[PDB]
With several copies, the nearest count.
Chain A
Amino acid sequence: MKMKRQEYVNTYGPTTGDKVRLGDTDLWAEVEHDYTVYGEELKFGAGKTIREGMGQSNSPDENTLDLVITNALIIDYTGIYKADIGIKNGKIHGIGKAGNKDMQDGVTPHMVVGVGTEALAGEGMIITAGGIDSHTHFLSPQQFPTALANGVTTMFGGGTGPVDGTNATTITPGVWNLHRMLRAAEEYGMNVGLLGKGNSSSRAQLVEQVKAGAIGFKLHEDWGTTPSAIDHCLSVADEYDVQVCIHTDTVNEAGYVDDTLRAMNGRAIHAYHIEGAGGGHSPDVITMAGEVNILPSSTTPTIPYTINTVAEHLDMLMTCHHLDKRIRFSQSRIRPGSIAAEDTLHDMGVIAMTSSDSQAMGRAGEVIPRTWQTADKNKKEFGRLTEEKGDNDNFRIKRYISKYTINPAITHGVSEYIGSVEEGKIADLVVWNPAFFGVKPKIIIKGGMVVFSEMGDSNASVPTPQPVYYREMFGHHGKAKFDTSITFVSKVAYENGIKEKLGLERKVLPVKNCRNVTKKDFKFNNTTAKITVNPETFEVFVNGKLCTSKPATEVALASRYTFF
């Protein structure tokens, strides 16, 4: 039978060739393929498809899904397509066409909808992987609800709490502090991984930390990021397959940027706030982004570049670092050049990740909105990418989504477990309404269970009445949180029973394959170039061509969605 295009789209969501506007941005996602058979689409409800002996099987099957996300529009580095998503044992069991082969054509064999299957209507929704925030300062446990409310399911970084060390650096230093924090982690719904103090010119002190459970090390100038420290830290990381994150020597005390790069010696390293406002060698830290071994990320305050970015920083730097009021400027000439270039470098795929720097020169619940605001800003300034095929922004979308999903996962050695919408991976997914894409998520799924979601009046006759606000769900509570949350550790710690020894009830998984991840290993952000900074004008150059952008007067995914 012939169904009107508008009626099909209302009932099942968009199909092949349809374009979806991402929020209030000028970014258009085109459905590349639809895995359904027209007339066999699954719909849940009274008199609908998913019913006993019809869409729901009566035939027992070893692949009976625990949950079915019907008619989802997947947005992932793997593609922008329409498919049913099947969850089983807290993992993505299958992606394709779910249902009952007894009564339906074209059913994906391992996507059986049966008696034990729960239904979630994804028709007209965008499904993406849970975001990974690789620059968390564990300052406040109140960051976690803020993060989840912005589609972030995993947080790497460090801290002890509201102390000067943490306030400045992502560092949980020493054995005792690492054990304490890993045990504190039990409370939360968020997946965690802790970094220890990499700022050491002695082996023993570094080794103790990896064995204590650290997923890596943070080298930060507050503890002195000297060439000796850089070499010693990377040497231990290489031995123990853990990642190193760096905040470089801003004041060029022990050397210039090239001296730091030399100390690294082509070894894998995660360069935080690569632009340099968040910290690092002045005025040339951005030059590191061109290097193959450097895995660079950006922090939220400098992305996107706005008319208030520079003004906000010339004071935000004074509250964080606690500077004298006698200090006025240098940052007023250095900063515009690198902040502007940074946005273009993101569009070029030179900067591979976006991070927060949460309550330590950056915002916790801003990674996702700010990534899409930058994507939108560039599209608006530079136009549609030349890389695009058709009337869509699919390539740009894939480049930007990778910044907060897959690329942080690759960097930290968790890409086999999380990071993307792929069969076999843990079911850490986010459901979005297209009108609110990138700004306000609907449902947060972690380990196949809903852990956090937008919810209305608790007394109310339906879940829709006002006030609708973000609340913790069943997957975030009781002993179910131990089933849905992961505490990542080093292989040494994992293999030596850290879980049992610390009495951790959460899922404990090791980080693996950190040492041999180069720029070539990333998804849609593999660009290497000769990045140079004029020491007089502070202008940034990519292979001799001025790299810049104009500041935004207004951004997407902001004013229309927020009260304050």
Chain B
Amino acid sequence: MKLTPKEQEKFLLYYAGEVARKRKEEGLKLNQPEAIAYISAHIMDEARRGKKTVAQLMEECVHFLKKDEVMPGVGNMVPDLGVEANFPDGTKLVTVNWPIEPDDFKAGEIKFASDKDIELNAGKEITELKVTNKGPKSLHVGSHFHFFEANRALEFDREKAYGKRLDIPSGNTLRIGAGETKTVHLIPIGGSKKIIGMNGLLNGIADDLHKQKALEKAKHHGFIK
């Protein structure tokens, strides 16, 4: 047989699916592991039959188990499911979003203090700036990237972006499509404003003293046209 360690895993998953099937046939509402194994075994079966595409299965398995076919809170506990199976074209990953239909019960439920919005970067002075991606390809810029050092494809008043970053949620990026024009909101960088790296236009404190040197380096390197 030459059973690989991954094949040995799949036997257990498949057997768990078979036990879950038996319990559903008995009329029992399936729990979290039973529900996952029941859907996993279906995917593994269809893959072996090699008549359905990954695309077909991803669609077919949404709400494969209905809210009344599982215990309360099971649907919300499993927002997505992933199962690798061998298809005629090889092993492919079947990714299902909402495999089990949710209900009103939620384990690990978060109840907010207030529905009021969170004021991020509070008290920082906003700078409105028009930017144009004159490049042939779209690009994104992160929340903490030194805006002044962004891809030379971006056309904007760089002097006004010196020592500033995007006033967007931490970890988010702003997209500027090829040819697209946008109004960005910039705020001054926190801490000491010791900008080291990126495009190396600054590599030091973003003070007035470093500004002329930084603008000259930006012009020389093609960021300022």
Interchain residue pairs A-B with the least CB separation, the first 5: A17-B113, A43-B171, A434-B108, A435-B108, A201-B197
Known: A146-B6, A563-B16. A9 touches B110 (CB 8 A): yes
Nearest Cβ on chain B to A360's Cβ, whole angstroms: 13
A227 to B80, CA, bound (A): 37
In the complex, residue of chain A having the shortest beta-carbon distance to the beta carbon of B143 = A49
B107 touches A102 (CB 8 A): no
User: Contact string, A435-476, partner B, CB cutoff 8 A, digits 1/0?
Assistant: 111001000000000000010111111101111111000000
Asked whether B90 is an interface residue with its Cβ less than 8 Å from the other chain, the reply is yes
Asked whether B44 is an interface residue with its Cβ less than 8 Å from the other chain, the reply is yes
A468 touches B2 (CB 8 A): yes
Determine the chain B residues whose CB is within 8 A of the CB of A307 once the complex forms. 53, 89
A436 touches B113 (CB 8 A): no
Nearest Cβ on chain B to A135's Cβ, whole angstroms: 17
A564 touches B190 (CB 8 A): no
Determine the chain B residues whose CB is within 8 A of the CB of A47 once the complex forms. 140-142, 171-173
B3 touches A38 (CB 8 A): no
A58 to B77, CA, bound (A): 40
**Stretch from A160-168, A247-255, A344-352 at the B interface:** A247-255
Determine the chain A residues whose CB is within 8 A of the CB of B93 once the complex forms. 312, 315-316, 460-462, 465
Determine the chain A residues whose CB is within 8 A of the CB of B132 once the complex forms. none
Determine the chain B residues whose CB is within 8 A of the CB of A365 once the complex forms. 4, 6
Interface size on A, residues (CB 8 A): 122
B169 touches A39 (CB 8 A): yes
A40 to B5, CA, bound (A): 41
Determine the chain A residues whose CB is within 8 A of the CB of B198 once the complex forms. 52-53, 201, 224, 226-228, 254
Count of A-B residue pairs with CB < 8 Å: 380
Nearest Cβ on chain A to B78's Cβ, whole angstroms: 10
B86 touches A558 (CB 8 A): yes
22 contacts between A and B (CB under 8 A): A2-B117, A15-B113, A15-B118, A20-B110, A21-B109, A38-B118, A53-B196, A58-B197, A102-B193, A104-B191, A106-B190, A201-B198, A254-B199, A255-B151, A255-B152, A308-B54, A325-B97, A434-B109, A460-B93, A553-B89, A563-B3, A563-B31
Determine the chain A residues whose CB is within 8 A of the CB of B85 once the complex forms. 564
Contact of B120 among A1, A51, A229 (CB under 8 A): A1
A462 to B48, CA, bound (A): 21
Q: Within B9-23, which residues are at the interface with A (CB < 8 Å)? A: 9-14, 16, 19
Determine the chain A residues whose CB is within 8 A of the CB of B11 once the complex forms. 563-564
Known: A467-B12, A535-B178. A100 touches B199 (CB 8 A): no
B2 touches A440 (CB 8 A): yes
Nearest Cβ on chain B to A485's Cβ, whole angstroms: 19
Determine the chain A residues whose CB is within 8 A of the CB of B137 once the complex forms. 252, 256, 282-284, 535
In the complex, residue of chain A having the shortest beta-carbon distance to the beta carbon of B174 = A47
B192 touches A253 (CB 8 A): no
* A100-B191, A252-B139, A558-B86 known, 4 other contacts, Cβ within 8 Å: A42-B171, A102-B195, A435-B108, A560-B73
Interface size class of chain B, counting residues whose CB lies under 8 Å from the partner chain: 35 or more
- Residue numbers of A with Cβ under 8 A of B are 1-9, 11-12, 14-24, 28, 37-45, 47-49, 51-55, 58-59, 100-107, 142, 145-146, 149-150, 201-202, 224, 226-229, 251-256, 259, 282-284, 304, 306-308, 311-312, 315-316, 318-319, 325, 363, 365-366, 369-370, 373, 433-437, 440, 454, 456-462, 464-470, 535, 552-555, 558-564
Nearest Cβ on chain B to A108's Cβ, whole angstroms: 13
Asked whether B101 is an interface residue with its Cβ less than 8 Å from the other chain, the reply is no
Contact of B91 among A106, A256, A259, A459 (CB under 8 A): A459
A5 touches B115 (CB 8 A): yes
A41 touches B171 (CB 8 A): yes
B71 touches A559 (CB 8 A): yes
In the complex, residue of chain B having the shortest beta-carbon distance to the beta carbon of A48 = B171
Determine the chain A residues whose CB is within 8 A of the CB of B58 once the complex forms. 311, 315
Nearest Cβ on chain A to B69's Cβ, whole angstroms: 14
A307 to B110, CA, bound (A): 32
In the complex, residue of chain A having the shortest beta-carbon distance to the beta carbon of B7 = A563
B77 touches A435 (CB 8 A): yes
Determine the chain A residues whose CB is within 8 A of the CB of B100 once the complex forms. none
Determine the chain B residues whose CB is within 8 A of the CB of A369 once the complex forms. 90
In the complex, residue of chain B having the shortest beta-carbon distance to the beta carbon of A366 = B91
A315 touches B36 (CB 8 A): no
Nearest Cβ on chain B to A542's Cβ, whole angstroms: 20
B2 touches A469 (CB 8 A): yes
Asked whether B209 is an interface residue with its Cβ less than 8 Å from the other chain, the reply is no
In the complex, residue of chain A having the shortest beta-carbon distance to the beta carbon of B115 = A5
Asked whether B119 is an interface residue with its Cβ less than 8 Å from the other chain, the reply is yes
Contact of B82 among A283, A433, A434, A466 (CB under 8 A): A466
Determine the chain A residues whose CB is within 8 A of the CB of B48 once the complex forms. 564
A3 touches B117 (CB 8 A): yes
B142 touches A559 (CB 8 A): no
Determine the chain B residues whose CB is within 8 A of the CB of A284 once the complex forms. 137
